[PDB]
Design a protein around this ligand. Sequence first.
Ligand SMILES: O=C(O)CCC(=O)C(=O)O
Ligand SMILES: O=C(O)CCC(=O)C(=O)O
Ligand SMILES: [Fe+3]
Lengths: 340, 338
Amino acid sequence: HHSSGLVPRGSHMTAIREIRLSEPESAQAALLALECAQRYAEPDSADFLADAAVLAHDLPRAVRREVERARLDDRLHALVVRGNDVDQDALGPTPPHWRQARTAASRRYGFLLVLYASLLGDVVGWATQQDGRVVTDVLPIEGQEDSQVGSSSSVELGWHTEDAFSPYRADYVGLFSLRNPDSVATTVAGLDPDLVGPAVVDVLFGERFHIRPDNSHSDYFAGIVEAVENPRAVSILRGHRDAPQLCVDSYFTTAVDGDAEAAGALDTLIKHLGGALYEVVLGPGDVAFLDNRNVVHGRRPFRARFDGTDRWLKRINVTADLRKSRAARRDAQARVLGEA
Amino acid sequence: MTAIREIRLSEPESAQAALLALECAQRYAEPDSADFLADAAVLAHDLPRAVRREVERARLDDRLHALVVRGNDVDQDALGPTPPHWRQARTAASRRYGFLLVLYASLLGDVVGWATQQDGRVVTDVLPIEGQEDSQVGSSSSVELGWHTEDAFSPYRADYVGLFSLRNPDSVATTVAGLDPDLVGPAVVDVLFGERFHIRPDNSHLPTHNSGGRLSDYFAGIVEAVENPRAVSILRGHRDAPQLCVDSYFTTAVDGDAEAAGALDTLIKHLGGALYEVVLGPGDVAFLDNRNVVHGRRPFRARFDGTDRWLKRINVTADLRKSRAARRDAQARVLGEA
Ligand SMILES: O=C(O)CCC(=O)C(=O)O
Ligand SMILES: O=C(O)CCC(=O)C(=O)O
Ligand SMILES: [Fe+3]
């Protein structure tokens, strides 16, 4: 049976918006994805992406109503849609590297992730991330266990706003779980301004910080070297005091040189978000969209087997405003930030 | 060549759009009722598929001038006379066209209004008013409405302006112009990219074009933008596809910037000449890409007998979230209530 509900975290009453698909809704979504996989080259080929926002309207109406409520909820942490069909037998083993992960068997899940994502905005990728793929792959890679990348395992992926340094950072990060046998969690935290000193909040609204590109990062790539060496003074909080946006990276954010008050406010915020971290576990066929304007995210330490049974998610970036990044894209329809 | 994208509705597609608009009119009070606007994006998806396909092509075309949907059903007899003032233009009979404008608009983005335009109505009215003939507002007639980016002064200016023509018996043209950067050359383009201009609010944001009972403080932001305009660019984004932000009556170069004043002078003559006509007949709805084109309206003689030209107008944003600092609360659509 279909159900939807609001799951609170701390004082965030609509932190998590959860939708459970009925079996007919799951079947309808799967049929649409399979039809797209029959009619279009790739989940992020130009032919499909030109049509993606119209085809997304063919998803179940009850689900579209709930996704639309999430899209306009400026206090959302995560929209979670549970109960999509994943045929584990037909999917086959978890690939050993993202370079081997754009498989024929998994295409239908890429298509479905783009269809859900296109209800929230327009899908984008990054030239420096998994060869500029829009639908990317999150799976453990042997040798990457202790790194601060999505392919890590043994070491906690430190929490951050996705692409925090960038004015073109996504509005949503989408995750479609294909398999997660050991129930490994995405970590999530938002700011509760009622748990932080108003003076600290005032400081975080100041353009008193440097957010440098993470290592996962030419007119465009000139700005990337400049962002490292001569970072612009930016705020961590922006917008309305009642609904501030958050932009911070637990490993790549500093106060401006000599701004001790700003250094203090930043470490107060880092301790607050560290303490407020909670978890979202996506079983097979569960999809989450994190509101990247409101939450930082990471991933818990876990034990990868590297035997083809490991955790595997499809991942996507979504923007509310594709047009605003045109200076960083190759042409009108191209979705790859930093391609030209 | 596809700067103007036209969809002519078949009778069935027109019928389907009308039935959806009437279903909305039966359910909700106003075409900008909060409950309707919450539901609008999903209801918009019930518009004809062929129409949604062409609107989506328009939405992602970053060189679009206007999407024009021709041949919506307008029952002229049932609509009754053109109101003599926008304040009186929220008529029972015209509600269905307000709802339909929002449904089309909600395929392109989220609808917004302004605290300082027609009392913060999201669906506004464009009709001639006695005493406004020679003004630079939408209710003018005798004097050409000078071309402009809608709300050029504001960082929260719309991505699309929607115009639903209810009535246009004398085929009065909307005017449109984009910038071809190649046709003006990289020298002027480089100047127009500089934060070297002042863009002040147009006269529609003044207390004289709102109800007298509206709070003085709604206008504080507008008056500040008139007295002390920020230094801003006219062009932004990619050199291959730059966005345009300029107003023929309210844009100046910053004091002492002779090179900027020259570049502005060149741009005005370029846009003024290329300025071309789109006639919206009854049932025609246009969405102007406000990032790409300035627009205006040709001069005409109003009859003031209830038969005059009448458009419904709406502002559309690609990104409602970005203006949250200027809105009362999450769902509120009226810019400048904060
Ligand atoms: O593995 C996860 O659950 C989250 C992935 C992630 O943090 C990321 O790639 O952005
Ligand atoms: O009357 C027209 O066609 C244009 C109206 C307009 O430019 C406006 O009201 O903003
Ligand atoms: Fe206008």
